[PDB]
Amino acid sequence: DVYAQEKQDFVQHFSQIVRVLTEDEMGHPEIGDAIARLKEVLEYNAIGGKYNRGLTVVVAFRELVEPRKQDADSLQRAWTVGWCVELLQAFFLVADDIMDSSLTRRGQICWYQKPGVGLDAINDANLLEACIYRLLKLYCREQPYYLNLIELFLQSSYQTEIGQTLDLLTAPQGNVDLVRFTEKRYKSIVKYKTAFYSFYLPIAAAMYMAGIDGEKEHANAKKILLEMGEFFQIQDDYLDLFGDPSVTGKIGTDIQDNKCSWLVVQCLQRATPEQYQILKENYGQKEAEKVARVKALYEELDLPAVFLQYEEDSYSHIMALIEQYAAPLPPAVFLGLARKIYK
Amino acid sequence: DVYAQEKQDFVQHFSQIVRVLTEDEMGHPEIGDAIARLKEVLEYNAIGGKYNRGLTVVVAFRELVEPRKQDADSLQRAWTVGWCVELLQAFFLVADDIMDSSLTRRGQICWYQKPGVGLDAINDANLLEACIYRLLKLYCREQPYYLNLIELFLQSSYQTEIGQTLDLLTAPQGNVDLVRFTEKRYKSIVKYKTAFYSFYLPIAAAMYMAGIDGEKEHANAKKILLEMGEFFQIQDDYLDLFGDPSVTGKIGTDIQDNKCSWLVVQCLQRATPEQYQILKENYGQKEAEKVARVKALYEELDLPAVFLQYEEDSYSHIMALIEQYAAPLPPAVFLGLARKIYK
Ligand SMILES: Cc1ccc(-c2cc3c(N[C@H](Cc4ccccc4)P(=O)(O)O)ncnc3s2)cc1Cl
Numbered sequence: 176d177v178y179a180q181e182k183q184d185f186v187q188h189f190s191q192i193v194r195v196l197t198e199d200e201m202g203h204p205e206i207g208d209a210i211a212r213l214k215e216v217l218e219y220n221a222i223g224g225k226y227n228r229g230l231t232v233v234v235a236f237r238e239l240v241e242p243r244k245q246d247a248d249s250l251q252r253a254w255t256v257g258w259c260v261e262l263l264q265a266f267f268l269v270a271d272d273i274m275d276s277s278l279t280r281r282g283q284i285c286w287y288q289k290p291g292v293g294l295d296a297i298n299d300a301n302l303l304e305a306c307i308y309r310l311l312k313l314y315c316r317e318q319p320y321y322l323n324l325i326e327l328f329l330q331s332s333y334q335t336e337i338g339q340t341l342d343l344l345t346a347p348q349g350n351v352d353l354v355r356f357t358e359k360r361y362k363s364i365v366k367y368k369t370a371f372y373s374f375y376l377p378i379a380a381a382m383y384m385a386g387i388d389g390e391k392e393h394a395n396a397k398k399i400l401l402e403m404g405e406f407f408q409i410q411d412d413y414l415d416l417f418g419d420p421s422v423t424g425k426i427g428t429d430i431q432d433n434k435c436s437w438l439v440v441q442c443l444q445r446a447t448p449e450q451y452q453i454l455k456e457n458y459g460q461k462e463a464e465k466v467a468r469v470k471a472l473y474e475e476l477d478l479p480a481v482f483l484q485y486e487e488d489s490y491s492h493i494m495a496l497i498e499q500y501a502a503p504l505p506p507a508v509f510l511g512l513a514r515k516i517y518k
Numbered sequence: 519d520v521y522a523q524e525k526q527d528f529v530q531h532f533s534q535i536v537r538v539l540t541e542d543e544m545g546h547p548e549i550g551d552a553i554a555r556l557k558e559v560l561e562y563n564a565i566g567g568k569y570n571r572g573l574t575v576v577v578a579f580r581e582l583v584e585p586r587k588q589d590a591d592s593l594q595r596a597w598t599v600g601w602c603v604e605l606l607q608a609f610f611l612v613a614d615d616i617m618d619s620s621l622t623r624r625g626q627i628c629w630y631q632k633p634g635v636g637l638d639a640i641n642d643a644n645l646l647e648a649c650i651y652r653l654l655k656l657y658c659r660e661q662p663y664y665l666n667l668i669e670l671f672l673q674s675s676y677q678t679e680i681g682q683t684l685d686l687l688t689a690p691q692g693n694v695d696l697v698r699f700t701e702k703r704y705k706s707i708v709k710y711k712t713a714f715y716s717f718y719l720p721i722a723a724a725m726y727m728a729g730i731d732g733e734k735e736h737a738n739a740k741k742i743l744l745e746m747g748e749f750f751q752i753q754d755d756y757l758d759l760f761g762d763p764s765v766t767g768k769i770g771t772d773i774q775d776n777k778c779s780w781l782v783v784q785c786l787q788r789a790t791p792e793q794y795q796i797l798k799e800n801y802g803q804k805e806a807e808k809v810a811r812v813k814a815l816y817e818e819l820d821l822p823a824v825f826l827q828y829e830e831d832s833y834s835h836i837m838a839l840i841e842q843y844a845a846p847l848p849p850a851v852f853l854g855l856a857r858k859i860y861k
Pocket residue numbers: 224225226227228231281373374410411414423424425512515516
């Protein structure tokens with residue numbers, strides 16, 4: 176993996192990301208305590224994922240820029256903008272975990288659940304967002320793509336927040352209503368909440384850093400990447416339930432949490448009224464036998480089969496989209512991602 | 519008041535602020551529900567203050583720009599950037615109210631306390647922030663000061679978030695510790711949490727909109743405005759306790775809430791160890807006789823007197839700062855504000 180390789184240089188750079196964000200203690204003694212706190216927030220919430228989103232910025236930059244324009248300072252900025260994507264994701268996660276009342280994240284006590292943090296985690300999350308724009312000013316203010324990157328991050332923020340709204344309206348935890356759980360609505364949530372920031376944002380960042388600022392180029396890439404994003408989340412939802420937990424790295428609570436998961440959406444498109452009721456009974460309760468009872472119903476409606484067929488059709492559709500819309504980017508940009516997620 | 523006058527045209531523009539932020543329903547049917555929710559958030563959280571911060575943008579614009587360059591579209595943008603300041607403040611308030619566990623804001627149930635909102639208010643607050651940048655793109659993307667305004671709003675956000683951090687570290691509600699309640703520390707909290715966004719931001723916005731982008735100009739104005747901000751909050755703290763409630767428009771809970779208020783800071787600079795204890799006893803409890811007991815101790819240390827002297831010294835200092843640092847802005851820019859707050 177072009178990823179496996181650059182992962183070292185990416186995580187080492189984090190040390191510097193922090194040094195700089197905390198350098199204004201030398202500036203202003205007054206605010207030191209606050210900066211100490213900011214250090215703690217970064218160290219706890221930005222480390223511990225697989226850094227797929229961040230690395231994608233660096234990998235795409237290497238693939239998009241003639242090697243002659245890849246000097247030490249250019250790579251410094253690719254590293255930094257990748258970290259900016261991870262910090263956006265960290266901001267969303269800290270805040271999503273408060274709102275969902277989640278207990279663990281990346282197999283670790285969620286930040287807001289730590290002794291002496293609680294709802295202070297809201298300000299903490301706001302700082303994480305701020306840090307994106309601090310890094311962009313510190314590393315990219317002199318660059319011709321500076322404004323392009325600010326607009327991208329801000330738009331990405333807005334698209335995600337919109338998705339979060341739509342989700343919260345659709346799945347009030349403590350309110351088992353399946354009538355709002357439709358394909359149209361599932362697709363929209365994924366597009367706004369996950370797909371823009373996870374697939375479009377990091378590639379679009381690399382494109383601007385490479386002098387590829389054209390609206391048609393970005394539209395074309397967007398068409399490919401939002402569809403990759405759709406498949407990714409659908410696979411996320413399949414494997415929450417049917418995923419081997421030692422393989423995935425997690426055990427799925429989507430059923431207990433009354434999620435608008437691809438699985439229930441398909442289940443509802445297929446059920447007879449008898450079956451609608453068994454689900455209406457069991458979907459969104461914590462009881463292990465009322466959760467075995469949905470899994471069994473999913474199984475009896477051969478949804479693992481429905482998924483395998485969707486995974487085949489989806490693979491064909493992505494490859495056609497890459498043929499049509501990749502040019503004049505190296506198809507490798509897209510193919511590298513398509514291989515991480517169809518793995 | 520140059521304020522009393524333009525207040526009409528400001529509040530009427532809000533209707534349009536909303537129309538535009540909700541116009542992408544025509545764009546995207548999919549996200550309609552979310553946009554409905556966004557409308558509700560704006561209507562509830564942006565309306566109902568005195569719009570001092572927003573109006574200051576409009577008033578300062580009129581005073582700074584030769585009347586020949588004040589066309590219909592220029593005033594549209596002044597209105598919009600004023601609303602952007604109010605939306606920043608609304609974002610901070612919705613989030614601060616969750617973190618403080620406050621029950622009412624502008625004599626109204628805090629948003630997060632409304633049936634069916636709760637911690638969803640966190641995403642709501644994020645949308646309010648987003649809306650700033652949407653409005654700036656929609657009204658100012660073609661203008662030469664566009665980037666200047668994005669950087670200002672983002673920096674203002676960061677300064678405020680830092681202040682919030684410092685405050686939360688200093689005043690853990692449920693932790694009566696008075697040793698961290700020092701003048702140095704009180705001053706820092708005010709500067710970062712209140713003064714930048716409330717005094718510097720709206721004037722600095724008007725300055726950029728007027729082609730006044732120079733670093734020395736902005737430094738000079740900042741020197742005046744951060745000191746106005748310091749006095750404002752000190753008066754806020756005095757009147758929380760000694761303010762006539764029918765005059766102010768609020769009854770003060772600073773004592774119950776273990777706030778780092780100017781009052782306790784002065785109280786601590788003055789108390790004998792006997793008095794340190796009576797306070798250490800009574801500061802931060804909800805009991806009306808352990809709150810009468812602090813008020814009485816403040817009184818016995820003649821703090822209303824200490825304030826009156828501070829208000830005189832502060833007035834002299836601001837007027838000297840305006841003589842020195844106003845040029846080449848119309849001193850009226852500063853004097854109009856100085857009169858709203860020394861009222
Ligand atoms: C843009 C992009 C986004 C995500 C990925 C991948 C993520 C991920 C993963 N992620 C874990 C979550 C997850 C588990 C199982 C299935 C999907 C996601 P985690 O790193 O702990 O969040 N676990 C196994 N494989 C993968 S591939 C790859 C790309 Cl190119």
